[PDB]
Amino acid sequence: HYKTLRYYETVFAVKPTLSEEEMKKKFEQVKEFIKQKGGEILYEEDWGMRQLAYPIQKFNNARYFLVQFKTENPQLPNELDFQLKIDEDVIRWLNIQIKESEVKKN
Numbered sequence: 001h002y003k004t005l006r007y008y009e010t011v012f013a014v015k016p017t018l019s020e021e022e023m024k025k026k027f028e029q030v031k032e033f034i035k036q037k038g039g040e041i042l043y044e045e046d047w048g049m050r051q052l053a054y055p056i057q058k059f060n061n062a063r064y065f066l067v068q069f070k071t072e073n074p075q076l077p078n079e080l081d082f083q084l085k086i087d088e089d090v091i092r093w094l095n096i097q098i099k100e101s102e103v104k105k106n
């Protein structure tokens, strides 16, 4: 059915020189940014430190977070992408539109 409420998944990688406390704060900041722009946070995963397939700004590891959200704001994925792009601490960002049935929980 045609519907303007859409579901999205965002995955981003934080540079490994931030402290555990800074990484978790970054995640909360991304969530609050999404919440600002008319998005409801449905789900979230912390994937911890992961080896990168190939280096990024001379880094071989990074901190991965994942968040799913829903919104009627069609520009939120554009917005989030720009925000994660310009954030110097976020060295990788990926935005995926997902189905409603792909929303997870716990």
Ligand code: NA
Pocket: 084, 085, 086, 087, 088, 089, 090, 091, 092
């Ligand atoms: Na960035």
